[PDB]
Design a protein around this ligand. Structure first.
Ligand SMILES: [Mg+2]
Ligand SMILES: [Mg+2]
Ligand SMILES: [Mg+2]
Ligand SMILES: [Mg+2]
Ligand SMILES: [Mg+2]
Ligand SMILES: [Mg+2]
Ligand SMILES: [Mg+2]
Ligand SMILES: [Mg+2]
Ligand SMILES: [Mg+2]
Ligand SMILES: [Mg+2]
Ligand SMILES: [Mg+2]
Ligand SMILES: [Mg+2]
Lengths: 67, 156, 129, 226, 70, 93, 88
RNA sequence: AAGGAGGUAUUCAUGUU
RNA sequence: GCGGCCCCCUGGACGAAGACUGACGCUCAGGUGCGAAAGCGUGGGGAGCAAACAGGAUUAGAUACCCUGGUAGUCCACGCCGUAAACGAUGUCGACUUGGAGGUUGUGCCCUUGAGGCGUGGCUUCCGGAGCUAACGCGUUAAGUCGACCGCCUGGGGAGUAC
């Protein structure tokens, strides 16, 4: 599966990059499991935080149906 | 020349679909009265068949004990499952002052003088195993000196 | 906390013999070296040495005769929680004399046999068989 | 007769199993690890092999029966050829639990095989129906695969040469029970406790087993020449 | 799971896509889990039991490849 | 004098290369119906399925002594048997 | 906790060079500063039992250090508990 | 709901979709 | 026991290299503090859920299970309470004794050739060897081998009850 953050040296995932985060949410808008994406556990936690911060700022939708 | 002794015969049961199947177990000890002793445990549907199986099994799987003039070399301790067994060399004339199973095994192994005392479960099967284990884990001055690289007089 | 370095040294010997190690090592002290010398002269260990200037390490090379370890049992007798002293008449006989009782007399640490001949009592460090 | 490091190394005796399967008791004979595979220290193999050869020679000179035990697919035919060509006995199919410790019952089966075999030569399997000539023939085939190498042994052997101490643990244990020394080629994943003459080395390559067997067969042959 | 009807796509084909989309979002499993309250102890017990048996079956399988059944 | 196993193995190791993914010369030791036993100088003689050699023409184009080339999978694989493969070497070149 | 600059000042005051951080006087002084600081926190946060457990460790450690110092050199101990304004 | 296949499961360009 | 995100105040753990103090340690009766849920007091708040309760069914009966409601309570603030299968049914501290597969969090090195290779720490799950275990098991995170100190046990019921 191979983590795409360990191989890029990324320190913090960043919630302002709405291209990487879109790859890590599903169509409904929920966060995809690390078991599927092959992300490491450390970057998974960072990634989940970034997605939640983006949702608050309405860069990402919470769900597919409130819009 | 091997003296033999049956210590215990005990009826067990299996409780098959039709009812209870009773069979017999025999505990025996054989020894040459000069430092070799073995025990045998045999099961069968009849008492003679059981004792026979036990005697044959006991004649095999015998071991050798380093006996000192009909007495022990030094105080020994034997332990098997829930049976502890203390044995001590005594002076000629005392006799074999031992318990129930220990009496048979010591008599047949050629110990004529000993002070023995069983601590713990006095189940004959485990008692026999513990006393034989104690007699086997007992060393003489010759082997102790050889192990330590000394002479017997050096060890005294 | 470590509160009985003598028992620790006996424990290392016991565990090393049970695990068939060639030699065991421990931090050194003069009491440990004295006990080690008695063991070596009684033939329970093959050799000992001390290496190190500021933090000496005492190394003992263990002995096996027929595959089996030479020291059959070794137990601390006097311990910090309960000290044992014996008068010259009351010295023990480990294994009817076939073992040694390391006794720390006023003339140094020696075996029970040596102290009994020298007419001394003292503290009983350990039993060795 | 005599082997050397180059011959052992050409046949692949130094190779062992992979590290995660080893036996800590087998550590002394381990040289190193290369690409997650243990390497067997031939400096230990050579003197041990020569010492085992000397003991095997002494037994052969005293007219001791040698039982060649090897049952893996990589050493079945190898062990059969070595024991035929050294005038000794072998087992190269599934070892029967109790071959040695239950020799009395196993011996009755030996007698059955001999009678069945002589009957086949005589022609007894003609009077009976065709089915009774295939059943008995099938019985003879099975008895040959199992006890065809020890039908003439006639007693408990004096030594076992087991190719795989791991695979043939039952045979080694019966030997230890009875009193029979064991000479065993022991890999890195095996237990050398029940073996009396350990010979570290790869036991899965056909080249290596042929190496060991040729040397052992020559030693026994020369010891019986005497 | 919001499925838009594609061009020329028959109804059966679109319906299969929609059913699989819902099964991928796991809606029905979620609803069945929220029908009734379960104590946190019950939830933890069930989670731990599934892990234990899943691990045991993986280990059992990975050892079944070792031996032959005939 | 003896070239101790250290130096001897130090030569051998660079003489036969054990990389999980490198093709090596392999001599067929035995032809069999559905399997082919090759030896590359390793822990064991691999049993390759024969259909990599009974070619698309249905011809067992090789026999004993043919220095074929095969892909090394593992010098030991679970059961002490080196794993080789011919169509892998085929596909690489 | 205690800032980098605050620790540096205290080490200079109570240690006999900038590199003397392990002295009993310096350790007691650092512990005392942090203990005094946390009083305001626990005045506003009476329900912070977890942080208060950390504080009790500090108080306990200061007593052990002062006991050692009193038994080891009484004059330094009197001088220290006078500067730091500590009873007993 | 029933069966089959693959795994302890994915790398499998993106794009298209 | 702790689960959205953000801020403020704050506790502990670990790693790297180095400097400093110089036995300052371990355990701990009594004592002190923390301590699920239910409950209690005072005042809030009350969507959902829900003892008690009310009704409807089921049943030979049904003071239950099932259904429709529904109060205290569950939430907050401040005080009580001090207890649980508060369990790893395994007291704390230290030392020693074969291995394997993982997780998680640091760090060093090598060619990072591209998620690689090679080491070294902390915590953690599962197998397991010797040894221990009535046995089950346990096993370097012991229930092996040892030492320090504290807590407890002495047939079952009466009874964790009476006074
Ligand atoms: Mg009793
Ligand atoms: Mg108390
Ligand atoms: Mg409450
Ligand atoms: Mg209230
Ligand atoms: Mg109220
Ligand atoms: Mg209701
Ligand atoms: Mg209680
Ligand atoms: Mg709990
Ligand atoms: Mg629990
Ligand atoms: Mg309790
Ligand atoms: Mg286990
Ligand atoms: Mg009461």
């Amino acid at each position: 599966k191979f983590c795409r953050f360990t191989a890029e040296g990324v320190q913090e995932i960043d919630y302002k990059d709405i291209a990487t985060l879109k790859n890590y949410i599903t169509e409904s808008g929920k966060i995809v499991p690390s078991r599927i994406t092959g992300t490491r556990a450390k970057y998974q936690r960072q990634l989940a935080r970034a997605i939640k911060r983006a949702r608050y700022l309405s860069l990402l939708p919470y769900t597919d149906r409130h819009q | 020349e091997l003296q033999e002794k049956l210590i215990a015969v005990n009826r067990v049961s299996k409780t098959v679909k039709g009812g209870r199947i009773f069979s017999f177990t025999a505990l025996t000890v054989v020894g040459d009265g000069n430092g070799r002793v073995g025990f045998g445990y045999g099961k069968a549907r009849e008492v003679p068949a059981a004792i026979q199986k036990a005697m044959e099994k006991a004649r095999r799987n015998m071991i050798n004990v380093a006996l000192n003039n009909g007495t022990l070399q030094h105080p020994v301790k034997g332990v098997h499952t829930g049976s502890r067994v203390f044995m001590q060399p005594a002076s000629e004339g005392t006799g074999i002052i031992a318990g129930g199973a220990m009496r048979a095994v010591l008599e047949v192994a050629g110990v004529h003088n000993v002070l023995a005392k069983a601590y713990g479960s006095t189940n004959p099967i485990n008692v026999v195993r513990a006393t034989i284990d104690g007699l086997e884990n007992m060393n003489s001055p010759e082997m102790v000196a050889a192990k330590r690289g000394k002479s017997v007089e050096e060890i005294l | 906390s470590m509160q009985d370095p003598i028992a620790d040294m006996l424990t290392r010997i016991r565990n090393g013999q049970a695990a068939n190690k060639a030699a065991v090592t421990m931090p050194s002290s003069k009491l440990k070296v004295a006990i080690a010398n008695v063991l070596k002269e009684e033939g329970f260990i093959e050799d000992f040495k001390v290496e190190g200037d500021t933090k000496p390490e005492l190394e003992l090379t263990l002995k096996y005769f027929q595959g089996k370890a030479v020291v059959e049992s070794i137990q601390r007798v006097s311990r910090p929680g309960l000290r044992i002293y014996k008068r010259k008449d009351e010295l023990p006989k480990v294994m009817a004399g076939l073992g040694i009782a390391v006794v720390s007399t006023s003339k140094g640490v020696m075996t029970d046999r040596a102290a009994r001949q020298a007419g001394l009592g003292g503290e009983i460090i350990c039993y060795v068989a | 007769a005599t082997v050397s490091m180059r011959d052992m190394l050409k046949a692949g005796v130094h190779f062992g199993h992979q590290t995660r399967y080893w036996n800590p008791k087998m550590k002394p004979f381990i040289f190193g690890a290369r690409n997650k595979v243990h390497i067997i220290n031939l400096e230990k193999t050579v003197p041990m092999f020569n010492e085992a050869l000397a003991e095997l020679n002494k037994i052969a000179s005293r007219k001791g029966k040698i039982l060649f035990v090897g049952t893996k697919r990589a050493a079945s035919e190898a062990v059969k050829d070595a024991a035929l060509s050294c005038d000794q006995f072998f087992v190269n199919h599934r070892w029967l639990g109790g071959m040695l410790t239950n020799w009395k019952t196993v011996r009755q089966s030996i007698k059955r095989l001999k009678d069945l075999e002589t009957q086949s030569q005589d022609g007894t399997f003609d009077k009976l129906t065709k089915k009774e000539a295939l059943m008995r023939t099938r019985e003879l085939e099975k008895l040959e695969n199992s006890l065809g190498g020890i039908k003439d042994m006639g007693g408990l052997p004096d030594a076992l040469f087991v190719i795989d101490a791991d695979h043939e643990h039952i045979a080694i244990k019966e030997a230890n029970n009875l009193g029979i020394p064991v000479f065993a080629i022991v890999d890195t994943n095996s237990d050398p406790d029940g073996v009396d003459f350990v010979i570290p080395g790869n036991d899965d390559a056909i080249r290596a087993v042929t190496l060991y067997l040729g040397a052992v067969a020559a030693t026994v042959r020369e010891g019986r020449s005497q | 799971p919001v499925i838009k009807v594609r061009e020329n796509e028959p109804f059966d084909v679109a319906l299969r896509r929609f059913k699989r989309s819902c099964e991928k979002a796991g809606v029905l499993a979620e609803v069945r889990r929220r029908e009734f309250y379960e104590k946190p102890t019950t939830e933890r017990k069930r989670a731990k039991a599934s892990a234990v048996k899943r691990h045991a079956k993986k280990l059992a399988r990975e050892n079944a490849r070792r031996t032959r059944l005939y | 004098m003896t070239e101790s196993f250290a130096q001897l193995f130090e030569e051998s190791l660079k003489e036969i290369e054990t990389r999980p993914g490198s093709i090596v010369r392999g001599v067929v030791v035995a032809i069999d119906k559905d399997v082919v036993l090759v030896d590359a100088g390793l822990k064991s003689e691999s049993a390759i399925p024969a259909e990599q050699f009974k070619n698309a023409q249905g011809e067992l184009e090789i026999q004993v002594g043919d220095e074929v080339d095969v892909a090394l999978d593992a010098v030991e694989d679970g059961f002490g048997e080196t794993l080789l493969s011919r169509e892998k070497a085929k596909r690489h070149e | 906790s205690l800032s980098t600059e605050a620790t540096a000042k205290i080490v200079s005051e109570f240690g006999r060079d900038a590199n003397d951080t392990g002295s009993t006087e310096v350790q007691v002084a650092l512990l005392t500063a942090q203990i005094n600081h946390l009083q305001g926190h626990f005045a506003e946060h009476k329900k912070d039992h977890h942080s208060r457990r950390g504080l009790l460790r500090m108080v306990s450690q200061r007593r052990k250090l002062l006991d050692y110092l009193k038994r080891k050199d009484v004059a330094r101990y009197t001088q220290l508990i006078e500067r730091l304004g500590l009873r007993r």
